[PDB]
Symmetry: D2
Subunit: 494 residues, 4 copies
């Protein structure tokens, strides 16, 4: 049904024993950092940039437009102090949610085997036998036998009866829960608007005006959800990328069609764990990464890969291996949530995440990775894809230090990134939109250039900038690709 | 320097969405469970067997010979209630340790930048400026610039001075520590006996008399350490397998020679994390698994892969992915420590571990895995290896349900397991030692048979036992291999 | 439409410079020799056996049943002098023929551009403007524009008119021809019985009574032709193999269906050259060899590969290369016609043919050849094919000197030969039919054994015979395969 | 010792049944035609050009400088009538020869077993017991046991005695020979000057003045022979290519070093057959073709591949297959000698040779051929080779109709030809030397362009010329490569 994947690594004793001492921003994997009070200051945001931050996430499930505007402006000023780092701006929509009601004593201890009524009258003050639910269509969506999760899966309930204004369930495990806790409906499609009037306001009155580059759309369940957001963005938001968040079984079932309409994918594994069995989540991650890789669509592994670091100064061993294997799987980007938003060690979390990515990236056998991609991609490829293929190929053969890609819309750099070169892709664009959207692709670093300039002049300017940024040196070869379509090798001299 | 590895997986939508409902003991990956008070009862040990326990670990860092004998006898009685499950018995040696001394007020808050003396006089009651160390040769082993870790890496110290009876260090980070905390000497060889007089007693007076099958030797640093334990076991312990625990940089540096002398490997990743950078541990794991796979030597990934479950009823997402990726890496076995020894959810930990292994095992593309092994193994292979190769190959081609291997010493089943068949290997042996040592190899299940029986009679008896245990059914093909060397295909009828 | 093929060779300087001095009968490629007056004596037939003759062809286009019976009995007596050489007996049917009529002056010089009438009245004495044709249905089979070839293609004629009892053609090239010359109808199906009453007599009253092993059926044009001969053979000729001769475009068009009904194929390239363009014949040869190889059906490249040697003591360079490339293509057998039937150097022709085959056989990269076969054969294979696969594989891995195959019907040896082992296949059979039919398969040498003997006793007897015949020596490994299905490796000792 | 080779073909029913009707000059394989009285007229030479002639061979073993000058000027006038065909001019040196002396009665019948004296006094009139030999160093080069061939191998002689001025041999086979017949010394190095004073005159006073492009040096035995001819050519002949003719065992033994100094290779198989066993010649051909292919050095298969056509209007079947397999082996060019020099069907011979090449070329699986080359070429490749690789690769991926290569010296077109693209290579050069030397490379067609022209202007002019010559059409893609190094794809419009 899904797809197959082939990883290839070369691990030396030297890489295990000798410390890595390269610049953290030289990594190919990009880091999405969630903004919050822990990194509210321009001082902390600059430290996050130096640590490896590439995309700032604005979580619009919390905070007002004011709260995100003082954060946005502080990021732009951190941006001014770090001009060689063009950060992508990502808005994460609140999206549809399901929550329990209020309780008379603010606490209930649901006991296993007992029966619990879930009513649609949200004004009802609940008790251990009956609790309100904010999702009015709940009785029409669940059937007898369906499982209902409450409070981050703290308690499961097997649906016994469905009625017009309530359902009756059996508490499957004993646990104590509180007020207004979240709910999940595994294997059931939630019939709530993908974009609420509040979500509509954040998109049209924040994302578009403030110039956000990505909309991470929470709880995408169909291609129609994506097309709705595309139409809502309209010509005003033509350049804003839509990144569906796969969070439930519906998104998995319709993933292929969702991906075809998308500009990229975010795997919300924590939320996914509340909809599928814990032992199945790694199956969904690796399948989604593989499908995105073969389409050339970027993918973010999310949302809290160093979760313990938001209290601890060092991650757990499992969190470290999880980051490394996500890179080896082929993820374009990795994400931090509470670690940077409200935690005690935000800079420490981004720092170690960058170091893990660099170690995993040095593992990859790029020739084997390249052939795995070529062997699995559909045979008829366009001229543009063939030339991008030849750039990656030629770069590996001559050990070029850089692939320089001239691109207005980003399409050329995306085609190159699809084939995963071992060297950095330096994309040059006159579009301020393009230079901030390519951040989501692995291995792409952008430079803004002026318009109406000849190709030869732009390339020589990029070579000089690359020399200053230590991205290339005298004696190196670099690839230039632009256009009809053209691939060029130039050696750096003088 | 090291080696390369190639994983291959096929992930369908059905495997993500449809629940797995096979017997937990049908998995190929085997589980090492650490015994302790949480599973002291025969009632709990039987539940662990049903959950997926294959090897019981006796941690001899704690408890006396009495403490392990009441546990051993309780395991033998759980064994009697589960006759179709032949558990391996593993003794984990205490091995060399390094600990700080005692303190006047039982607590010190070492401050960053301050200086700390480490003395070899263990009777000295320490303070924040001077603390004893149990390793007398410490000043002769560390040099200026070496890093000294204390209390599970809670504080690092840079060595400033070395003298005959003490060293002087600079506290690199502020932290509060207590009495008798462990110490680690990254990148330095610890000159302590691999086997103490206490370790010698546990081997010769417990492991050999009680019939332990494996010695997990803590802190192996050289092939000479392995040969010492081999000579100490002598003819009395000829059938006991030596499993070195790789725990520091010395074990990594000399891993190839250590492996050549070993019967298998245990990756002690938690202890390894106190000797190498956290971002390097996954490099060592994947390299060691790959080297063991290509030698046909079994490897245990260890020691606490579901660490949070020893307090929580469900593991973290990172712990689940860590187990799954260790299986995909090619580990023969996975290990639980505190989760089963003293935790609250021992049976729950083994249960989910088995489920994760089954999901990862269903991912593997076994044909691609087979060719990866054949392409990387040295070309001149013996007759015995070629016939074992042909059994795995033939089984995959005809979709055989079982490979039946007749083996006195286990060598034939080990050769087959080296090539990772997609079907179970049913090893038949008259040796009670052999049927309990093959547990450490992935995919091998053993049956004890009587001696002095013809090959045809033993095979037909195994087929009948396999039918009863639901390992094979009418219409299936099974492979039989024995011997000169013979490969046979038989169909199950009637 | 057709198929693809992949040859692989390893050519050393030593093989070019150092002479080959192995026994000519050790070659894998088998030689079909056409019997005639040049090899009528038992003395010459024994020399042909020593030179490399494996199959004797009785051309029934010429000679009576007496003429072939004195030859047959002389072959049986040569057989008695060479007991370690079991020759196959092949009857080549006369089959349908088309010939011109008689001429008034026995010679006509047809001039280009002139017009020539071909009448169906065979009694008409012809001239340069009108000549009879033995094929009465000629006007119903050719259309205007069709080409008619006369006297081994000495003159072509473009059909201008068709009428009930004649056709009118334009002579396309000037040439002089004689009486009763053969004719060919390129791209037209000849509507003549595949088996005449004379052909029926040779099959039922010679081939079946004398015990012929193969019927090479001239001018097979459809699967129905093969089934007709199969029904004509009936239970009396159940064990006689049908080898269709592909001689025209109809046989090429319907080759797949003809092959499915056949026991093998003979490429009659000389006759094929009179039906297709000369530059297309090598296309048909390589395609037919490749299709037969992938079906496991034997193929003979024919009919006169050393044609010049029937006058010259040494072949031309092109004839030598043609034999070598046919072997590299993958032909099971090669054929001599006039070189042995009536030529001056019959023994010299078979001798050099054997030497060429040995040189080409030493070129082949057998591992690459094996994988080419495995990669192109349909994935679901039976148990019997998988075990035969494993025998070839195991033999190559351990460098076994022999694959010993116990087979009643020959099926087991055919399955092994399909995978082209680098070592000889020694087939043991109690069937005198089987031991003389397997001659057509490359690399198979047969030994007749007594019935009602245990498998172990037969194998040990074959090993002892192989040692005497220098086919194997002390220290070698050999493979034995029989059966349910069994693969066994035994080492030769003592 | 030597090398390995992998051919890959795809043969359809359509290619066997449907006639090919493309232009004979569109073939990739190039034809060397030997000039002589049969093609002395400008009228015949133009017919040879239309039939597929690409290189004219001037055999300087016969004829004077006058005889070759009237032929040369007639070729230049045929060249003027066919401006879109730039013929290469090849001089074949007489080189060292060995001939018997004169005879009293002009005929001797040497009898097997008899003894024959070979004297160095060339004035001696010979008889059946003693015959002169033109090679004075003969007794110093042969030893007892060496074989001496006389009159195209009509009789062999085993050396019995060597003395200062004669040798004594035993006639090994009975045969009648005449006066001044050639001689061959298998497995012995002939100590004669590679370039005689007569050969020196043909090079310096014909080849260089008349502008010959290739020197086919007869009987090259060492790299020193090649360097001698290179020094003799000097700066005046810097642009003349040296093509050693491999004719004996010395040339085979030292082939690698000879090839490294050469610009190409000619396999003189007929002369080679007089030095090695007939069954070994195809081994030498395939090994030499494979080594030349992997070096990117062109190779001519020679000298008389349609030998029978010099009397017959149609070649033998073996001659047709020999041409086809030489193309499939990977030969750059094929050669005719007597067929065009003095035969009755010169135009008919070139015509069918072109048709065979086109059929074999349509067989080739070019992707598999490309990967076979990439997998076997040494891993570190230059920038220039990588870009040429990418041009061939890109052309195959997008099905480009042409690779346009701008090249001054021909090096760029040679690098492309090394990787065997399925489409024609159109090389553009201002050098009249370069446009006539690239003829020897498979698939390269040259166009002379003016100097001091921009790259973009030259490319557009080539596209327009390609459209007129029907080499490309509207809608096609073509590759352009020049330079630093540049690969460009352009689509043909309007
Ligand atoms: K959100
Ligand atoms: K321990
Ligand atoms: K016949
Ligand atoms: K010559
Ligand atoms: Mg959510
Ligand atoms: Mg430890
Ligand atoms: Mg015929
Ligand atoms: Mg010569």
């Amino acid at each position: 049904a899904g797809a197959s994947m082939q990883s290839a690594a070369n691990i030396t004793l030297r890489q295990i024993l000798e410390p890595n001492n390269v610049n953290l921003r030289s990594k190919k994997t990009h880091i999405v950092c969630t903004l919050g009070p822990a990194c509210k200051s321009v001082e902390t945001l600059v430290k996050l940039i130096d640590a490896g931050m590439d995309i700032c996430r604005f979580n619009f499930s919390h905070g007002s437009h004011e709260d995100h505007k003082e954060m946005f402006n502080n990021v732009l000023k951190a941006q001014e102090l770090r001009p060689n780092c063009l950060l992508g701006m990502l808005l994460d929509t609140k999206g549809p949610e399901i929550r329990t009601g209020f309780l008379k004593n603010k606490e209930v201890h649901l006991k296993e085997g007992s029966k619990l009524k879930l009513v649609t009258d949200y004004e009802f003050l609940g008790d251990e036998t009956c609790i309100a639910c904010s999702y009015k269509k709940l009785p029409q969506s669940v059937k007898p036998g369906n499982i209902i999760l409450i409070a981050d899966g703290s308690v499961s309930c097997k649906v016994l009866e469905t009625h017009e204004d309530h359902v009756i369930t059996e508490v499957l495990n004993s646990a104590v829960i509180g007020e207004r806790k979240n709910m999940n409906l595994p294997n059931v499609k939630v019939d709530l608007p993908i974009i609420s009037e509040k979500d509509k306001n954040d998109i049209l009155n924040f994302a578009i005006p403030m110039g956000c580059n990505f909309i991470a759309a929470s709880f995408i369940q169909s291609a129609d959800d994506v097309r709705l957001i595309r139409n809502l963005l309209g010509p005003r938001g033509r350049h804003i990328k839509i990144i569906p968040k796969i969070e439930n079984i519906e998104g998995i079932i319709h993933f292929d069609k969702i991906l075809a309409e998308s500009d990229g994918i975010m795997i919300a594994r924590g939320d996914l764990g509340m909809e599928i069995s814990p032992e199945k989540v790694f199956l969904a991650q690796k399948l989604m990464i593989s499908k995105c890789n073969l389409q050339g669509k970027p993918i973010i592994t999310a949302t809290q890969m160093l979760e313990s670091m938001t209290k601890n100064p060092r991650p757990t061993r499992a969190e470290v291996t999880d980051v490394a294997n996500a890179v080896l799987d082929g993820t374009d980007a990795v994400m931090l949530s509470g670690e940077t938003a409200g935690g005690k060690f935000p800079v420490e979390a981004v720092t170690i995440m960058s170091k893990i990515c660099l170690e995993a990236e040095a593992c990859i056998d790029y020739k084997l990775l390249y052939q795995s991609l070529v062997n699995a991609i559909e045979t008829p490829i366009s001229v543009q894809e063939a030339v991008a293929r030849s750039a990656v190929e030629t770069a590996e053969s001559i050990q070029a230090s850089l692939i320089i890609a001239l691109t207005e819309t980003g399409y050329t750099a995306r085609l190159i990134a699809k084939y995963k070169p071992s060297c950095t892709i330096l994309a040059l664009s006159a579009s301020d939109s393009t230079v901030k959207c390519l951040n989501v692709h692995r291995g792409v670093t952008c430079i803004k250039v002026g318009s109406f300039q000849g190709t030869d002049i732009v390339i020589r300017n990029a070579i000089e900038i690359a020399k200053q940024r230590n991205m290339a040196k005298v004696g190196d070869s670099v690839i230039a690709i632009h256009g009809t379509n053209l691939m060029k090798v130039v050696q750096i001299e003088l």
